[PDB]
Amino acid sequence: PEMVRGQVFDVGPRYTNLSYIGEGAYGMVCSAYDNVNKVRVAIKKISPFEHQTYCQRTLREIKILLRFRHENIIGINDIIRAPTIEQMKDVYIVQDLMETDLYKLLKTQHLSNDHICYFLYQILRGLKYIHSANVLHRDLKPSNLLLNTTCDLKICDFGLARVADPDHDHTGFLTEYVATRWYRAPEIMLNSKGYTKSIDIWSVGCILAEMLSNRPIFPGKHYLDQLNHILGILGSPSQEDLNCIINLKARNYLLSLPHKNKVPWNRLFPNADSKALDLLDKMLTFNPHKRIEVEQALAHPYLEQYYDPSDEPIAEAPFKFELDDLPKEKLKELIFEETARFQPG
Ligand SMILES: O=C(NCc1ccc2c(c1)CCO2)c1cc(-c2[nH]ncc2-c2cccc(Cl)c2)c[nH]1
């Protein structure tokens, strides 16, 4: 068996000539040559069976990506694992191989307005399909946007994805949240569980702002610092937007703050396209009910060169799963059963 960065990567005989790409807490990704299709692929080794959270994320992603098929969404081409539950210590997911990601690009590359326009179009085109399946990504950020040498974009990492549940979205003030801080919508810190489509739109808005200047727009250093960065730019919420927040602790926190004026988008982004800033404003709307939806965003004048709703496909049916109260052993069983279709037997 081939070894990489001092770890076993037993994917053979089908996949050979492994080269390191990157890694996570419970996984590792390598590039490898597919001997059947005669192409280099990306292989993600995951070792999640020791922690139930890692099992839940592994299972959510495998189930979703096996039902999804879209040009702007990473696929699962094959799954390698041992033939029995007992012998299965790791799972290997064979996926699209991509040269870079938007996090990597933004560290060193200035994006032309045409690149920002095309990247945003592909993000929203992929997002339309995800939302049409009644699924929320819930962790959109530049490192979850993969790009190949011709600028084709694919959304990856569905580990934190959920089925949309807008009727059970309300919660208390400063409620614990898992998704990446800098891309969190203001309502997460105030009264939302992140169970509505508007949560993904906010993250896309943050990504657009980051593409315009190569810097995250709201780089909070801790939980409540995130809301203060957002308010620092949007300004104080209006009476109407406050009246939509019925939770007293959340509302009174906003009321306790001195008045702050909105920082104009053309002051933060003086070289940006005016149509891009108009769309940014609509994605970065404080009130999640007033926030632009993915299909409206696609129809915005800024994306007129690409907009074609007949070439922006939707899922063949909504998604339906309950993994919250399932032990790591039972989740191992479901990972085994979900990956059975790829075994030679
Ligand atoms: O699933 C992918 N990315 C998210 C991810 C990566 C590692 C990991 C977890 C999630 C949970 C535990 O460990 C993924 C990326 C790719 C990919 N294809 N081509 C390049 C890349 C890639 C680019 C940058 C970093 C990494 Cl890890 C991979 C394929 N799948």
The superfamily (CATH) of domain 98-324 is Transferase(Phosphotransferase) domain 1 (1.10.510.10)
Distance linking the first and last C-alpha atoms of the chain: 21
- Nearest partner of 198 among 320, 312, 285, judged by Cα: 285
Q: How far is the CA of 109 from the centre of ligand 1 (A)?
A: 21
Sheet strands side by side (includes 15-23): 15-23, 27-34, 39-46, 91-95, 78-80
- Sheet of strand 145-147, all strands in order from the earlier edge strand to the far edge: 100-101, 145-147, 153-155
- Where are the chain's structural domains? 1-97+325-345, 98-324
Taking the CA atoms of residue 52, residue 172, residue 163 and residue 98 in that order, the dihedral angle to the nearest 10 degrees is -70
**Ligand 1 atom with the shortest distance to the CA of 48:** 12
Tell me the C-alpha distance between 344 and 9, whole Å.
Answer: 19
Q: Do the first three CATH levels of 1-97+325-345 and 98-324 match, i.e. the same topology? A: no
Q: Measuring from atom 21 of ligand 1, which residue has the nearest CA?
A: 98
Resolution in A: 2.0
State yes or no: is 139 an active-site residue.
yes
DSSP-assigned letters across all residues of 232-257: HHH-SPPHHHHHT---HHHHHHHHHS
Tell the residue nearest (CA) to atom 20 of ligand 1.
Answer: 98
Superfamily of the domain at 1-97+325-345: Phosphorylase Kinase; domain 1 (3.30.200.20)
Residues pairing with 178 in the sheet: none
Q: Minimal CA–CA distance to 333: which of 58, 95, 93?
A: 58
Pair of tokens at residue 63: 């189930």
Give the integer Cα–Cα distance in Å for 241 and 91: 46
| CA 146 to ligand 1 center in whole angstroms | 9
Instruction: Consult the annotation and say whether 275 binds a ligand.
Output: no
Would you state the structure tokens that stand for residue 253, as one six-digit string? 């926190």
Q: Which helix (H) or strand (E) holds 46?
A: strand 39-46
